[PDB]
Amino acid sequence: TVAYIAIGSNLASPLEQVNAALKALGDIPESHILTVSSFYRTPPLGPQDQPDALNAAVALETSLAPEELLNHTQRIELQQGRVRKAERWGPRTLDLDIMLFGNEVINTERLTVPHYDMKNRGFMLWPLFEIAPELVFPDGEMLRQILHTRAFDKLNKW
């Protein structure tokens, strides 16, 4: 099954963090990196001068069950990032989000797929559209259609 995973960083040299995360994802058992997007720059909201985030998307072919993949992504986040509790409400070292898992719809306390609110997040949809322009969501909505109907500015590359 192809899993689409979002990667975000805005601390401790994001280009390094995203590359470290790609290496870690690529190493997850019975999984293989199919496609990686370009790296996008996501400015902070608000006048406050916080660090920009680097955002990317990866297509990962995997034979793992969805919650098994989550076990690995959470492991990677905890080992590589999540240094301070404050990262929860602010800039963070590494954020790995499972956006989609084939055509699966999953609603558990651990795992919700498609990822919460992802259709309203340009920093997810742009890199996703780069790697899967013909993608259709589990509800039948085309990704391309979402980008023609929702108010997103085009994110610059990193």
Q: Which residues are catalytic?
A: 82, 92, 95, 97
51 binds, among Cl ion, Mg ion, none (CB under 5 to 8 A by kind): none
DSSP state of 15: H
Instruction: Report the residue number, 8 or 114, with the smaller CB distance to Cl ion.
Output: 114
Identify residues 92-121 at the interface with Cl ion (CB under 5 A).
Answer: 114
**Residue 97 site contact among Mg ion, Cl ion, none (CB < 5 to 8 Å, cut-off depends on kind):** Mg ion
71-79, 94-102, 125-133, 139-147 -> range binding Cl ion (CB under 5 A): 139-147
Interaction between residue 139 and Cl ion (CB under 5 A): yes
Q: Which does 95 bind (CB under 5 to 8 A by kind): Mg ion, Cl ion, none?
A: Mg ion
3-state secondary structure of 156: coil
Q: Which residues contact 69 (CB under 8 A, 6 or more apart)?
A: 3, 28, 31, 60, 62, 98, 101
Q: Which residues pair with 3 in a beta bridge?
A: 60, 101
Site string for Mg ion, 79-108 (x = CB under 5 A): ----------------x-x-----------
Give whichever of 78 and 136 is closer to Mg ion, judged by the CB atom.
78
SS (H, E, C) 90-157: CCCCCEEEEEEECCCCEECCCCEECCCCHHHCHHHHHHHHHHCCCCECCCCCEHHHHHHHCCCCCCCE
Partner interacting with residue 91 (select from Mg ion, Cl ion, none; CB below 5-8 Å by kind): none
CB closer to Mg ion, 24 vs 143: 24
In the block, which residue shows the tokens 């999984």? Answer: 31
Both tokens of residue 8? 């975000």
CA 73 to CA 24: how far, in whole Å?
9
Single out the residue of 34, 41, 106, 138 in contact with Cl ion (rule: CB under 5 A): 138
In degrees and rounded to multiples of 5, residue 117 shows phi and psi of 65, 10
- Residues interacting with Cl ion, by CB under 5 A? 15, 114, 137-139
